[PDB]
Amino acid sequence: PPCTTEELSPPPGGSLVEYSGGSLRVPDNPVVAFIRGDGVGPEVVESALKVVDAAVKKVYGGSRRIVWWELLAGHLAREKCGELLPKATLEGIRLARVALKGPLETPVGTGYRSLNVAIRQALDLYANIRPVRYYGQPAPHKYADRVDMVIFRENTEDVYAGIEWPHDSPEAARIRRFLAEEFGISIREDAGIGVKPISRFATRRLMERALEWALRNGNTVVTIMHKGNIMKYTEGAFMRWAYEVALEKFREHVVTEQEVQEKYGGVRPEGKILVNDRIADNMLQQIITRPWDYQVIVAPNLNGDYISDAASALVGGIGMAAGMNMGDGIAVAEPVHGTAPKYAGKDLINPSAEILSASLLIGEFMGWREVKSIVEYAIRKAVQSKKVTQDLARHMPGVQPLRTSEYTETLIAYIDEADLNEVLAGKRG
Amino acid sequence: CTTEELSPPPGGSLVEYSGGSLRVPDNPVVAFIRGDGVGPEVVESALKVVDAAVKKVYGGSRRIVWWELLAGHLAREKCGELLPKATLEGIRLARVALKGPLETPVGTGYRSLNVAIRQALDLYANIRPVRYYGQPAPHKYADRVDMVIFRENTEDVYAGIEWPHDSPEAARIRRFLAEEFGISIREDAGIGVKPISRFATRRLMERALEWALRNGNTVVTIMHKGNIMKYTEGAFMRWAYEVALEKFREHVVTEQEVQEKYGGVRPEGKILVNDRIADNMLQQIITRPWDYQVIVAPNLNGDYISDAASALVGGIGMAAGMNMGDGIAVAEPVHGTAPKYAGKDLINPSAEILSASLLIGEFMGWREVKSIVEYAIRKAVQSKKVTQDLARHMPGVQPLRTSEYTETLIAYIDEADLNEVLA
């Protein structure tokens, strides 16, 4: 693994994924960067590589294969390179355009998971994508099986921009003074102050990727989650700008709820994606009450975070939550969960989240749809056969849980002995 | 319709708040508003169900003097103005009131009339209890959802401080931030301001703690997103803990103290005060409902967590709540006017009823009333005797029009083994 730029060298037998025009060009022997990360990262990452390779080999008869290229970040970069996040790692991802990473440990004294943030910002990975699916595991939601969503979250603005000042700082006092004198606005002297920005530019690019995802996956509904009745010029504007870019650039593929009832017989015109919106609080209540009415959810930073987390709790998949941050022609997949130190190196951790992150990177972003299908099948199969790691064996009395390595081997056996005839029913290209 | 045109009805001995405690007679005056939309109906049902319950649990040594007030459409037709100055001070005097959902005043300067009301009386605490009444729910653990959300309802994102992206005001603050604070905001971005004060946080937390002590709650959880908004949500959390240890030391313990000074188990005689990142909190009421009771949060988070919990127990339509200030409180349902059901004798009145119960049984100390009100509602559910809103989820069950359902609850209240309903 590389510590410097000159050391950057994609492994033998692979070709770089390319981004020309507005499309990703994926060779059959694509170089894909991977970062082991910290805590359970190495374990779950190595599990993901094995499961995906078996998946790739199985569905494409060996004509395709990933050439994994290791890059370093976290404890392994500190140990080998003397630093947590070498420039060479960021340059490497930008070169490969696609990478799988394990969770990273947050440097003491820095802003939350700052390393993930530094990576996302350096590569302009503005879209956070969190799919939430049910794999048959025990869940607290009676309608867990009816939860099949994907959250497209704007990941650069909102209160996450970090614009805020302590209540007793001179800056805050200055801002309070400016607000009263210039706008006659009164804010208590003992109030902390935060600023919430939402832009047309960030909203449009996010909505566009979401609409493209919908077309790619054949989704029939895209929902804008916002609290526009309270925050009119931030969240309301977000909703407004998202609707606009939809009609402006996807006019022939979309229809709003208004147009559905108005211009049509209140019925769905086939081939058209319904683009609607829901006030955030109502949205939370509806995924709980009628999850089947929702598929793709578009939201600004904070609402996106809350809605995807709640959804994962409903399907019993908090620990299996997969994710990916995408920019233009570039993406980095990673599980939602952290480094889980209490399980690090014990061969006990559930690798599903990291595996599904890989599946998300290769099956969706890279287009190898069949890979995703065979992977989700193997997982759903393992859960049904109760061949799972201890976290899932919680609601399975009598079940002898599997170690990480054994769960990996179990998924690979389901992949190899799988009947593609039906497993790949209506998905190909 | 005016300040002088209204006066306390005969027999009512106005509820009075003095010193550090409320004081209510046995014939108190409790203001009330029919509101509008399905309001009139629901408020009606609430009135009778309450009295019935009141006469049953107290034999007859107690009664409420319902003093009517106007707001909404039934004030626009008699007073000319939606919210008459009387209806407000008529509440400030009564100290306690019940109301239906008012209509959104199109063309005015307010989001809703409830805002003007709460702002006028300084009802800074939005209290939403969430309980399961046996109805069909999406949550496998609906029955384990028994919480009350104390939501700061005057600050945060709800203060309405924001500016359109293309407004000259936006441009001024944008240039002000970049120049004096090196902060650059995109020219095409709307800008909102989020304020969280020590003052507002403290009084909300104190009200929550007193509520816990008064009602025997053993857990008070602070919901915040302090890892992202350190100076607003994070400060909110720090200030909540701060006033807890400062004015309720003897009655509370932190999770850290539980671990270091106890075998990792909460001392039974003390209230556990802990905190949960907003995301974790949303997940936890879904995964471990039974580990939470009283939830304290800023305006937005409080709105979200209470709304989610209500959906879990299948009680979206019957979510009750009240706004409380210093010695004064106005209770009402969360749901709106729902015009599509106005005057059609169909809307579920449980929310309005549960609001009165929250007002009389909780705020006014008449606990017995709450006990029997909930007993009846749960009895109705465990008998398929409910309005259409819930019937649609019960195979074969016939929708008992609002009126029918109202009588059923009262019928259950009259005939009841009070000696066992209470324990």
Side-chain angles (χ1 to χ4, degrees):
Chain A
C3 285
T4 56
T5 304
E6 48 270 63
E7 301 181 308
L8 285 186
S9 186
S15 293
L16 302 171
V17 169
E18 280 159 40
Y19 190 54
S20 62
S23 56
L24 199 68
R25 306 180 75 173
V26 188
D28 291 337
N29 65 316
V31 164
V32 175
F34 74 92
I35 292 168
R36 297 179 200 281
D38 311 318
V40 300
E43 277 155 294
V44 302
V45 162
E46 85 168 62
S47 172
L49 303 205
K50 286 179 177 56
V51 176
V52 175
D53 283 356
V56 166
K57 177 173 185 175
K58 182 72 194 318
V59 308
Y60 302 131
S63 67
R64 296 179 182 177
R65 73 186 204 67
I66 297 169
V67 177
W68 299 97
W69 181 31
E70 172 157 26
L71 294 184
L72 302 168
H75 81 290
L76 291 176
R78 172 178 59 232
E79 287 158 34
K80 183 178 189 295
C81 310
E83 69 183 317
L84 298 169
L85 183 60
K87 290 282 190 173
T89 300
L90 299 179
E91 305 172 330
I93 297 173
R94 185 178 306 138
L95 180 63
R97 290 197 174 83
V98 287
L100 171 71
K101 70 178 290 291
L104 285 173
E105 219 178 299
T106 155
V108 175
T110 319
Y112 196 43
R113 304 192 178 304
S114 61
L115 291 188
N116 297 350
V117 174
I119 295 174
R120 298 179 189 184
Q121 294 183 171
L123 307 163
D124 189 39
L125 307 180
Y126 59 82
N128 173 243
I129 300 169
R130 288 171 176 183
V132 184
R133 316 255 289 199
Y134 184 57
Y135 297 97
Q137 70 262 51
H141 196 22
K142 298 180 184 180
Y143 308 129
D145 55 59
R146 220 79 75 74
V147 173
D148 189 359
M149 325 170 155
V150 57
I151 292 73
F152 265 72
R153 165 173 65 132
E154 199 298 317
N155 205 209
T156 70
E157 309 185 324
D158 208 336
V159 301
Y160 284 78
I163 303 173
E164 59 173 340
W165 351 68
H167 71 290
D168 56 4
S169 68
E171 298 84 337
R174 177 57 182 119
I175 295 177
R176 287 190 284 270
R177 193 256 200 177
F178 180 82
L179 291 176
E181 300 183 5
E182 297 304 74
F183 307 127
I185 293 177
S186 295
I187 288 188
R188 289 179 174 285
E189 211 71 54
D190 61 326
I193 304 175
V195 174
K196 181 189 174 116
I198 291 295
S199 76
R200 181 175 183 277
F201 171 81
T203 301
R204 296 173 85 261
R205 72 203 307 215
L206 174 84
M207 182 64 165
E208 295 170 4
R209 303 326 147 212
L211 284 175
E212 292 167 6
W213 175 285
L215 288 165
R216 172 78 56 82
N217 296 276
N219 296 113
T220 60
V221 67
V222 173
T223 304
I224 302 166
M225 183 191 170
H226 67 282
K227 189 63 180 157
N229 65 309
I230 299 302
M231 295 163 274
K232 301 177 168 64
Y233 313 126
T234 51
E235 306 242 319
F238 183 90
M239 178 211 83
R240 193 159 53 64
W241 293 321
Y243 265 124
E244 292 182 4
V245 80
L247 280 47
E248 184 195 312
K249 304 184 173 178
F250 298 84
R251 182 62 280 191
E252 287 303 80
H253 302 96
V254 307
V255 62
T256 70
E257 261 177 357
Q258 276 266 56
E259 308 183 317
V260 171
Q261 50 138 293
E262 218 167 302
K263 299 184 61 180
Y264 299 107
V267 186
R268 119 297 316 169
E270 191 66 65
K272 278 55 172 57
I273 296 172
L274 176 66
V275 177
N276 57 10
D277 69 280
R278 299 282 182 271
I279 298 175
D281 33 20
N282 181 53
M283 184 73 265
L284 285 171
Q285 297 196 314
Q286 293 312 111
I287 60 169
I288 289 175
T289 303
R290 308 182 215 293
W292 52 80
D293 288 334
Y294 304 102
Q295 282 166 42
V296 177
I297 302 174
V298 175
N301 233 329
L302 198 59
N303 291 333
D305 187 54
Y306 293 3
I307 201 71
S308 63
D309 289 326
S312 287
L314 297 172
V315 299
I318 293 169
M320 292 169 84
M324 172 172 64
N325 260 261
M326 179 184 83
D328 296 318
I330 183 172
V332 176
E334 58 159 45
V336 174
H337 72 64
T339 67
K342 295 193 295 69
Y343 292 73
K346 299 180 172 179
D347 196 30
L348 294 179
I349 190 69
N350 186 346
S352 301
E354 192 73 52
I355 297 174
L356 288 163
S357 289
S359 175
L360 177 56
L361 180 66
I362 297 160
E364 297 274 354
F365 192 66
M366 287 160 76
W368 293 10
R369 179 178 280 120
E370 297 98 324
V371 170
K372 168 192 172 76
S373 305
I374 193 60
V375 170
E376 306 198 320
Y377 156 83
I379 289 173
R380 287 192 167 74
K381 189 76 178 307
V383 173
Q384 287 307 165
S385 307
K386 310 193 182 306
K387 306 296 292 179
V388 305
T389 37
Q390 44 116 288
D391 60 307
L392 294 181
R394 74 173 153 184
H395 266 79
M396 302 180 186
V399 172
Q400 166 51 252
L402 306 182
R403 300 188 185 194
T404 312
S405 57
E406 304 174 309
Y407 176 66
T408 294
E409 307 319 309
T410 299
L411 299 185
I412 289 174
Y414 286 132
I415 288 173
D416 294 347
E417 319 167 321
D419 170 35
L420 306 173
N421 208 66
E422 51 191 302
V423 175
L424 300 180
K427 58 273 293 187
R428 278 180 176 181
Chain B
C1 274
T2 67
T3 308
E4 229 63 64
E5 293 189 65
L6 291 306
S7 182
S13 301
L14 294 177
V15 184
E16 62 179 3
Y17 173 63
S18 185
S21 58
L22 185 68
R23 294 148 62 174
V24 54
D26 289 50
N27 56 71
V29 178
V30 179
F32 82 78
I33 299 177
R34 299 172 180 293
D36 64 23
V38 300
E41 304 187 303
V42 310
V43 185
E44 154 219 65
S45 180
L47 308 188
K48 288 186 286 63
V49 173
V50 175
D51 288 313
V54 177
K55 191 181 190 307
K56 175 63 183 176
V57 298
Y58 303 124
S61 63
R62 284 181 176 177
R63 68 174 179 63
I64 296 177
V65 193
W66 298 90
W67 179 31
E68 177 163 49
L69 291 182
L70 301 183
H73 67 177
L74 294 182
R76 160 77 64 171
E77 302 184 63
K78 178 177 177 296
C79 305
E81 67 181 315
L82 293 176
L83 175 57
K85 297 294 181 179
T87 299
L88 279 177
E89 199 145 306
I91 295 176
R92 185 182 304 165
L93 174 61
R95 285 298 167 62
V96 299
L98 179 70
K99 63 182 296 297
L102 296 181
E103 179 192 305
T104 292
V106 186
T108 190
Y110 296 85
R111 274 216 317 287
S112 79
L113 286 176
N114 296 170
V115 178
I117 296 171
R118 75 172 184 62
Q119 295 184 308
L121 297 171
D122 185 39
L123 312 179
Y124 61 85
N126 183 59
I127 302 167
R128 291 177 178 175
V130 182
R131 320 190 185 305
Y132 179 55
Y133 294 103
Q135 68 277 56
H139 198 189
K140 289 186 185 175
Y141 309 129
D143 71 308
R144 302 303 293 129
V145 174
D146 178 40
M147 319 156 175
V148 48
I149 298 72
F150 267 72
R151 167 196 172 204
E152 200 301 311
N153 203 41
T154 72
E155 313 183 320
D156 197 340
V157 128
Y158 289 60
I161 304 174
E162 47 169 353
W163 301 280
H165 66 102
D166 57 333
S167 67
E169 291 63 45
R172 282 165 70 184
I173 188 161
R174 191 179 297 121
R175 288 171 63 88
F176 165 63
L177 295 179
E179 189 178 80
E180 295 186 52
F181 302 118
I183 302 297
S184 64
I185 307 273
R186 295 189 55 90
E187 265 65 54
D188 70 328
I191 303 175
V193 170
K194 174 203 185 71
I196 297 295
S197 75
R198 181 166 179 290
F199 174 81
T201 297
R202 289 169 65 78
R203 59 182 187 170
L204 177 80
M205 184 59 157
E206 302 174 341
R207 295 300 134 288
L209 286 177
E210 301 166 356
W211 207 90
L213 285 169
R214 180 189 305 130
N215 295 298
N217 292 292
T218 55
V219 188
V220 176
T221 305
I222 298 162
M223 177 191 179
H224 65 281
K225 192 58 194 292
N227 68 312
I228 297 303
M229 297 163 273
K230 327 179 201 312
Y231 311 133
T232 57
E233 302 240 334
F236 180 95
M237 180 219 72
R238 179 190 45 168
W239 294 323
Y241 271 121
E242 195 179 79
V243 71
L245 310 190
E246 174 193 306
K247 307 168 72 166
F248 294 84
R249 194 82 224 57
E250 186 280 311
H251 296 291
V252 310
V253 295
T254 64
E255 271 181 354
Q256 324 293 68
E257 300 177 328
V258 171
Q259 286 303 315
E260 304 185 303
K261 300 182 62 183
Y262 306 99
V265 181
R266 173 190 67 81
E268 225 306 293
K270 297 188 184 307
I271 299 176
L272 171 62
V273 176
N274 57 12
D275 71 275
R276 299 283 183 268
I277 297 298
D279 326 301
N280 194 61
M281 189 70 251
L282 286 157
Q283 297 183 321
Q284 289 274 298
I285 57 167
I286 293 170
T287 65
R288 305 279 188 283
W290 56 82
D291 293 325
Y292 303 93
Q293 302 180 206
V294 176
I295 301 179
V296 170
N299 222 322
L300 192 54
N301 288 344
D303 181 64
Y304 286 8
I305 195 73
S306 58
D307 286 343
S310 288
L312 292 174
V313 304
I316 298 176
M318 34 206 292
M322 73 168 40
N323 259 265
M324 182 188 87
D326 288 356
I328 181 176
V330 173
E332 95 178 74
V334 176
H335 68 59
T337 66
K340 282 178 279 55
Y341 292 60
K344 286 187 176 300
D345 195 51
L346 290 169
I347 186 61
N348 190 331
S350 300
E352 196 68 50
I353 300 176
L354 287 171
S355 300
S357 177
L358 170 60
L359 175 66
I360 304 168
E362 296 261 53
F363 186 62
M364 293 186 265
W366 291 14
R367 190 166 300 182
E368 301 67 45
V369 177
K370 175 181 181 180
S371 297
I372 200 168
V373 169
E374 307 195 322
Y375 154 79
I377 296 177
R378 293 184 176 174
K379 178 57 182 300
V381 169
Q382 292 280 176
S383 293
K384 299 182 185 301
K385 260 55 184 178
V386 303
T387 34
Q388 66 171 301
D389 61 305
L390 301 177
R392 69 188 183 191
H393 296 147
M394 306 178 93
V397 181
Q398 294 293 171
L400 297 179
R401 293 177 293 84
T402 307
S403 59
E404 297 185 297
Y405 175 85
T406 307
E407 303 307 308
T408 310
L409 298 181
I410 299 174
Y412 291 141
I413 298 172
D414 302 316
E415 55 198 61
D417 291 58
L418 296 172
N419 58 61
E420 71 169 297
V421 176
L422 305 176

